[PDB]
């Protein structure tokens, strides 16, 4: 997260991290006791999921292996359209005040809405600074018309853009697959943006969760 600050402790119980070799790979969100929602770009054969602490490296956190995952079949590594994946935990997440399911959206929040994006991704770019504590930043939803001025026909209608005018506030490498929450619901998953990160007036691009409700529920049901 670029130009953010540490999240208030205990305010992101639905936030998870996907680890590989005890290093941060991606962010993610807890959907229910058995499932984690993340970006399809985060695909791996095996995952170690960190849950229940704002601090990566915290002995208090749960560490659950996940051997199965399912990318949306429409996912393209070329254009990043349909960038979402469900990760099946090997054992159930043990719920508490620090581990809770996210609230999935019923509706799509409009342009101009204030949201919060969170993650353990680098706080600097191109030079990397990976934090221990979970970082937060507030951004506003940007209309597809305004976002098209930057990214042209690379943008699809199931992608959601967010940022702050003339501001570096944004997500970066390591935050991928993590949550963008607006008015109490999960509206986006961190997907892509410009590189170096935090470039003013280059919006962050997210998978628009409200467009994928059916697939998310059907996939969990089928692979239960
Ligand atoms: C989209 C995506 C896939 C895998 C990634 O692995 C990583 O380790 C990072 C990072 O900067 O921690 C980002 C990734 C993004």
Q: What is the CATH number of the domain that holds 89?
A: 2.40.10.10
Based on the domain organization, do 149 and 106 belong to the same domain? yes
Based on the domain organization, do 5 and 116 belong to the same domain? yes
Resolution (angstroms) equals: 1.9
Task: Give the integer Cα–Cα distance in Å for 9 and 108.
Answer: 28
Q: Which residues contact 221 (CB under 8 A, 6 or more apart)?
A: none
Q: Which of 198, 107, 119 is nearest to 160 (CA)?
A: 107
Based on the domain organization, do 187 and 219 belong to the same domain? no
Q: Which of 204, 39, 191 is nearest to 115 (CA)?
A: 204
Q: Which of 78, 212, 81 is nearest to 155 (CA)?
A: 81
Ligand 1 neighbourhood includes 71 CB (under 6 angstroms): no
Are 86 and 75 in contact by the 8 Å Cβ rule? The answer is no
What's the 3-state SS for 73-135?
Answer: CCCCCCCCCCCCEEEECCCCCCCCCCCCCCCCCCCCCCCCCEEEEEECCCCCCCCCCCCCECE
CA 13–ligand 1 middle distance (angstroms): 22
CB count in 10 Å sphere of residue 39: 26
Cis ω for the linkage preceding 126 (within 30 of 0) = yes
Provide Rg for the chain, Cα atoms.
16
Based on the domain organization, do 4 and 18 belong to the same domain? no
Which residues are registered as beta bridge partners of 138?
116
Based on the domain organization, do 107 and 206 belong to the same domain? yes
* Three-state secondary-structure class, residue 163: strand
Q: Which residues contact 208 (CB under 8 A, 6 or more apart)?
A: 108, 157, 158, 159, 160, 187, 188
Q: In residues, how long is the chain? A: 224
Helix spans in the chain (H): 144-151, 213-222
Task: Give the integer Cα–Cα distance in Å for 27 and 24.
Answer: 8
What is the extent of the structural domain holding 74? 13-101+213-224
Based on the domain organization, do 6 and 34 belong to the same domain? no
Q: Which of 68, 44, 162 is nearest to 112 (CA)?
A: 162
Q: Closest ligand 1 atom to the C-alpha of 175?
A: 13
CA 31–ligand 1 middle distance (angstroms): 21
Ligand 1 neighbourhood includes 173 CB (under 6 angstroms): yes
Based on the domain organization, do 60 and 132 belong to the same domain? no
Split into its structural domains, the chain has a count of: 2
Residue 127 exposure: Cα atoms within 13 Å on the Cβ side? 1
Nearest CA to ligand 1 atom 9: 174
Could you tell which of 22, 39, 42 is best to mutate to test the pocket of ligand 1, judged by most ligand atoms within 8 Å of the CB?
42
Phi and psi, residue 22, nearest 5°: 65, 25
| DSSP track, 169-187 | -B--TT-TT-EEEETTEEE
Method by which the model was determined: X-ray
Ligand 1 neighbourhood includes 39 CB (under 6 angstroms): yes
Based on the domain organization, do 82 and 154 belong to the same domain? no
Phi and psi, residue 5, nearest 5°: -150, 165
CA 23–ligand 1 middle distance (angstroms): 10
Q: What angle do CA 109, 115, 118 make, to 5 degrees?
A: 130
Q: Which of 186, 176, 58, 42 is nearest to 121 (CA)?
A: 176
Based on the domain organization, do 93 and 121 belong to the same domain? no
| Residue pointed to by tokens 């961190």 | 190
Nearest CA to ligand 1 atom 8: 25
Q: Which of 90, 84, 81, 104 is nearest to 30 (CA)?
A: 104
CA 184–ligand 1 middle distance (angstroms): 26
Are 153 and 167 in contact by the 8 Å Cβ rule? The answer is no
Residue 56 DSSP code: T
Ligand 1 neighbourhood includes 40 CB (under 6 angstroms): no
Based on the domain organization, do 155 and 136 belong to the same domain? yes
Q: Closest ligand 1 atom to the C-alpha of 42?
A: 3
Task: Give the integer Cα–Cα distance in Å for 167 and 148.
Answer: 18
Are 98 and 13 in contact by the 8 Å Cβ rule? The answer is yes
Ligand 1 neighbourhood includes 41 CB (under 6 angstroms): yes
Based on the domain organization, do 65 and 122 belong to the same domain? no
Based on the domain organization, do 148 and 163 belong to the same domain? yes
């Amino acid at each position: 997260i670029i130009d953010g600050a540490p999240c208030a402790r205990g305010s992101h119980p639905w936030q998870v991290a996907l680890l590989s070799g005890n290093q941060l790979h991606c962010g993610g969100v807890l959907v229910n006791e058995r499932w984690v929602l993340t970006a399809a770009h985060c695909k791996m054969n095996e995952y170690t999921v960190h849950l229940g602490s704002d601090t990566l490296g915290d002995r208090r956190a749960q560490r659950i292996k996940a051997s199965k995952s399912f990318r949306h079949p429409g996912y393209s590594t070329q254009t990043h359209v349909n960038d979402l994946m469900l990760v099946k935990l090997n054992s159930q997440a043990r719920l508490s005040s620090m581990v809770k399911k996210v609230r999935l959206p019923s509706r799509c929040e409009p342009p101009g809405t204030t949201c919060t994006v969170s993650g353990w991704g680098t706080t600097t770019s191109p030079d990397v600074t990976f934090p221990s504590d979970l970082m937060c930043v507030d951004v506003k939803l940007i209309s597809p018309q305004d976002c098209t001025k930057v990214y042209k026909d690379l943008l699809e209608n199931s992608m959601l853009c967010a940022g702050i005018p003339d501001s570096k506030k944004n997500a970066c490498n390591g935050d991928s697959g993590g949550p963008l929450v607006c008015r109490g619901t999960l509206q986006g998953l961190v997907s892509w943006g410009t590189f170096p990160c935090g470039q003013p007036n280059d919006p962050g691009v997210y998978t628009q969760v409200c467009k994928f409700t059916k697939w998310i529920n059907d996939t969990m049901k089928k692979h239960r």
